[PDB]
Design a protein around this ligand. Structure first.
Ligand code: U0S
Ligand code: U0S
Lengths: 304, 304
């Protein structure tokens, strides 16, 4: 019993982190096979970041200008290319610790683990969600760029995020490993405001199932609702609309607990309208939305 | 910027997890050098756990009755001994992935990372604190026993916890790696009620410093207090008494922020008396107490 914000074990990703330096800029790279992936802004001065022309800045860079260090050993860069907002540095040595991997582009509301790194060295691991406004609420200091987000399916690491930027509001933006930003963000130090950070309703409902499984039951009420009625309340409270697809995804938790999804929606509706009244659910005083239905099943079943 | 509940990178500990089976009981072991450490209750049936005589049950066990599997390779057990509530299984092979390590017994209020494991396989990593009543609020299913808690100082893993038990109230109890339980708990399926789960005041104050560093400032008020005045309020709210030693430990965060420790205590006093009024601090609607002053400095400074 018990329910924790849990990250994937990080060792398979630790084995891929390297340091990338270009001139005076140092950040992190991801070494998979004989390619190191890193933010293309490694080539920028902080001056450059105000209005960078990446193709033009990259013309002035040679393979030997990209210093890649794996632990305290230098890797030889034999090619480089820009793909969207990432650089791919071809090295002469395959990472011997390369895990089974995929590159995936996740949808808003999907969770992942971040291995926060500085100078190619892991500092910590935490669980994130892709917010509905395509930001993440991370913990990233200067030097953390190139830190990655991932999920694991048994022995296969699906890399879904690489850290690039902090918005002036202190939320985070980055790319998939093909270098495409999540959301409308760009790798430029300019006015970039995030949209509404709506609550991921299907994830809240998953977590309320997790709470029931773990004996936190006080919020279960005598009511049901419909998707349309629930969605009127969701809209009012800046929750994501619940779709039939979300109801289908919660089916296994409904089955396990015997609480119909729409009954749990009616419990959530009352929580939104009534608040917590100073009570807690799974040690939280707010409704937690960074567990997906799959996360709840995984943690409640002991998947390795 | 941003502040996350962050675990240590788990790879060094992943490299030490093994499966231990004795008869029909399977749980996790920690393989360091040529010793595997595991809960002594691996020798119990669930029947045995009601009133086990561990010395008597262990007489019926031989080295060959302890099946130790590291990945999908069997380790040869060449000796066993009981130390307090742990077994030490001597194997014929030093773990080649043994990190630099220490065994430490932590104090209540100290935080650590848990690598939750089943059948010797890592499932996830999360951050815990030793509660003032010597329980932890973990996420542990049947099979997670022998999962460990640790801190890392650069390349040295300090193991501080091994999981043994879930109390009937669904909180967790375990031992240090010398097999001594934290608190008054025993490895028997009996009436074991936890004492008051008081809030770790020095950790709350650390987190309020973290909040200020990260721009969450609304709760800063115009007041100061004294330790004795603060402690009258702490006692009323089931907070740990603040000592001069705690004030000294918060000195670096006071310095960094320019907020005197007793001024932050007066801000905390007002939060306790007034509540949050529906506001949040670092995305929390309650006062978080599972960051130590050292954790706040570490995460705010990017230590690897
Ligand atoms: C030395 C150290 N680690 C090596 N690995 C091979 C691939 C992994 C990651 C996925 O499984 C194991 C790591 C190889 N040689
Ligand atoms: C193969 C794979 N891993 C090995 N390791 C030696 C000790 C560590 C843990 C601490 O640093 C590295 C792991 C050795 N051989």
């Amino acid at each position: 019993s018990g329910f924790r914000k849990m990250a994937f074990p990080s060792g398979k990703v630790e084995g891929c982190m390297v340091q990338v330096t270009c001139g005076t800029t140092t950040l992190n790279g991801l070494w998979l096979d004989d390619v190191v992936y890193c933010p293309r802004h490694v080539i920028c001065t902080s001056e450059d970041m105000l209005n960078p022309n990446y193709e033009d800045l990259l013309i002035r860079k040679s393979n030997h200008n990209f210093l890649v260090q794996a632990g305290n050993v230098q890797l030889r860069v034999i090619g480089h290319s820009m793909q969207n907002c990432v650089l791919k540095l071809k090295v002469d040595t395959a990472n011997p610790k390369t895990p089974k991997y995929k590159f995936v582009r996740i949808q808003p509301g999907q969770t992942f683990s971040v291995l926060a790194c500085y100078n190619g060295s892991p500092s910590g691991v935490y669980q994130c969600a892709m917010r509905p406004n395509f930001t993440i609420k991370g913990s990233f200091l200067n030097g953390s760029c190139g830190s990655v987000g991932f999920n694991i399916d048994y022995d296969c690491v699906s890399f879904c995020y690489m850290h690039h930027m902090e918005l002036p509001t202190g939320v985070h933006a980055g790319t998939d490993l093909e270098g495409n930003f999540y959301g409308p963000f760009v790798d430029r130090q300019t006015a970039q405001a995030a949209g509404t950070d709506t609550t991921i309703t299907v994830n809240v409902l998953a977590w309320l199932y997790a709470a029931v499984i773990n004996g936190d039951r006080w919020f279960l009420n005598r009511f049901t609702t419909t998707l349309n009625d629930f969605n009127l309340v969701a809209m009012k409270y800046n929750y994501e609309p619940l779709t039939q697809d979300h109801v289908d995804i919660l089916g296994p938790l409904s089955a396990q607990t015997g609480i119909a999804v729409l009954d749990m929606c009616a419990s959530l509706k009352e929580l939104l309208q009534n608040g917590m009244n100073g009570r807690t659910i799974l040690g939280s005083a707010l409704l937690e939305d960074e567990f997906t239905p799959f996360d709840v099943v995984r943690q409640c079943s002991g998947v390795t």
